[PDB]
From a paper:
RAD51 is regulated by a set of conserved ∼35 aa long BRC repeats located in the BRCA2 tumour suppressor protein.
SP2 and SP24 contain cysteines at identical positions in the LFDE module but differ in length and sequence. Stapling of SP24 leads to a significant increase in α-helical character, evidenced by a more negative molar ellipticity in the 210–230 nm range, consistent with the intended stabilisation of the LFDE α-helix. The two arms of the DVP linker in SP24 have acquired different orientations relative to the heterocycle core. The linker in SP24 does not interact with HumRadA22, but its heterocycle stacks on top of the endocyclic Leu1234 side chain, creating a small hydrophobic cluster. The carboxylate of the terminal glycine residue is one carbon shorter compared to an aspartate side chain, and rotation of the LFDE helix brings it closer to HumRadA22 Arg270 (HsRAD51 Arg254) in the SP24 structure, to maintain the salt bridge.
Residue numbers in the entry:
A (entry chain A): 110 to 284, 310 to 317, 321 to 349
B (entry chain B): 1226 to 1243, 2056 to 2064
Write the structure that this text describes.
């Protein structure tokens, strides 16, 4: 049950130290609420030692909405005193053009995690940006809802299996642990957290990604 | 580009029956 720091101390106290492994943390909010910025920040933070809030790991980023920015990871790494090239080498990225491809990527991810095991930098984080984007776009009409819901549910079950088997933290953005983001100082609110206390945290988006 | 062998992909499908990835650098 390792924990990855968000880059923000107040957001970390709200999450009980940061996002947990063997779990799926879902951040929901409108465009610009900080979801994608929090994903880019986590992709850097995971690579740090546990004293510095990371897990000496690598990160996987599934991009469904054309939001992944390597130059953003470079900026966050540089402004946090890390080598940007090494950070970029430790983040695996794949763009999903439709729901089917999105699920297919989870089997390819499973394979890379097995390989990452026995290394000094195993994969510890899997990010899925806009988890429902394709499902909503491809399934319009009450008739397609059954397949839409079942396909999403199947994807989430696979994410849980990947998390529980490879001891990885799963982080998903949407327009188990649910966090609502809303609008420089953004606000984060826990949604009926099962073990953590009800509450809110104020955070900023900077050249260091997410921070107090 | 991060290649996964057909064999590795088969093991993955087996494990969860009971275009790909690239490093951010562009490999
Ligand atoms: N390089 C950057 N430096 C500072 N702030 C940035 C940078 N890139 C993006 N932002 C901020 O992040 C906001 C977008 O947030 P984001 O989480 O990516 O939205 P979404 O999750 O809906 O895709 C922008 O409105 C801007 O204020
Ligand atoms: C190489 C055989 C293979 C396996 C799978 C998933 C188990 N998918 C594809 N496309 N090909």
């Amino acid at each position: 049950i390792g924990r990855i720091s968000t880059g923000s101390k107040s957001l970390d106290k709200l999450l009980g130290g940061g996002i947990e492994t063997q779990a799926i943390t879902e951040v929901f909010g409108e465009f610009g609420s900080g979801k994608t910025q929090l994903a880019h920040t986590l992709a850097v933070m995971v690579q740090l030692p546990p004293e510095e809030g990371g897990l000496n790991g690598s990160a996987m980023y599934i991009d469904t909405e054309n939001t992944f920015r390597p130059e953003r990871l470079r900026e966050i790494a540089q402004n946090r005193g890390l080598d940007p090239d090494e950070v970029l080498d430790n983040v695996a990225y794949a763009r999903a053009f439709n729901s089917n491809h999105q699920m297919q990527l989870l089997y390819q991810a499973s394979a890379m995690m097995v390989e990452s095991l026995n290394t000094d930098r195993p994969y510890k984080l899997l990010i899925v940006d806009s988890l429902t984007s394709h499902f909503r776009s491809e399934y319009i009409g009450r008739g397609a809802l059954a397949e839409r819901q079942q396909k999403l549910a199947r994807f989430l079950r696979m994410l849980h299996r990947l998390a529980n088997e490879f001891d990885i933290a799963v982080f998903v953005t949407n327009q188990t642990l649910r966090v609502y983001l809303r609008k420089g100082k953004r606000i984060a609110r826990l949604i009926d957290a099962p073990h953590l206390p009800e509450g809110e945290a104020v955070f900023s988006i900077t050249e260091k990604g997410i921070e107090d | 580009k991060l290649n996964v062998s057909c064999q590795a992909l088969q093991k993955a499908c087996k494990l969860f029956s009971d275009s790909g990835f690239s490093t951010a650098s562009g490999k």
